[PDB]
């Protein structure tokens, strides 16, 4: 009754790893269960990653494209997935809920599967404003989409305090977050949509923590940093 899990790998600069070697590792990895694996990379590595990742349960995702011609070109190039709204887009680049929403709408229109990221800050979490922050974030996204559009959409729930910090959310925190996201999608979009929607957890997921997190009722996989432990995160999606 859970939808198809997704294990998404999100590439970031100054990774100590070789991308190529990580691709080689992923290519060798047998994945017995049904899961869509996604290697999201930055522009300059898109061509190398496409060239080189041939695991068929893997798709390449672009990241943060917001231009008509660039979306169109990525699609041309055979890139069908895109990650958008990721934490630093919001807290650093100044991408508002609306800018992310418009990027998500543009990508869907261009035939992309979209991993749309949402998530609260340390401060937002601490003052109990997680729900309102994250529901505001997704509400902005939902405003720009139509019901059919949700088939192309994936939500990555990422607490900002958990991204890259070694501080993972607890199964109860991830479940609470995912549950309210899905409750909101249910009530505001439809229970068929909430039902089919992949809500992924991200922020300091590793091998050990992942399977407990995937056990949670509303967790449909993970958005994780592209690192060799990602393989163990893939396995946890059962
Ligand atoms: Cl497996």
Swiss-Prot record:
InterPro entries (alphabetical): Aldolase_TIM, TIM_sf, TrioseP_Isoase_bac/euk, Triosephosphate_isomerase, Triosephosphate_isomerase_AS
Cited NCBIfam families: tim (TIGR00419)
A molecular function GO annotation: triose-phosphate isomerase activity
Family: Belongs to the triosephosphate isomerase family.
Subunit relationships: Homodimer.
The name this protein goes by in its record: Triosephosphate isomerase, glycosomal
Pathway listed: Carbohydrate biosynthesis; gluconeogenesis; Carbohydrate degradation; glycolysis; D-glyceraldehyde 3-phosphate from glycerone phosphate: step 1/1
Keyword Isomerase included in the entry's annotation: yes
Broadest EC class assigned to this enzyme: isomerase
Keywords: Gluconeogenesis, Glycolysis, Glycosome, Isomerase, Peroxisome
Coiled-coil stretches noted in the UniProt entry, renumbered to this chain: none
Cell compartment(s), UniProt: Glycosome
Enzyme Commission (EC) number: 5.3.1.1
Principal place of residence: other
GO CC term, one of those recorded: glycosome
Misc. comment: The enzyme contains a high proportion of positively-charged residues in beta-barrels V and VII (compared to the homologous regions in other triose isomerase sequences). Since 2 clusters of positive charges located at precise distances on the molecular surface are common to 4 glycosomal enzymes, it has been speculated that this might represent a signal for entry into glycosomes.
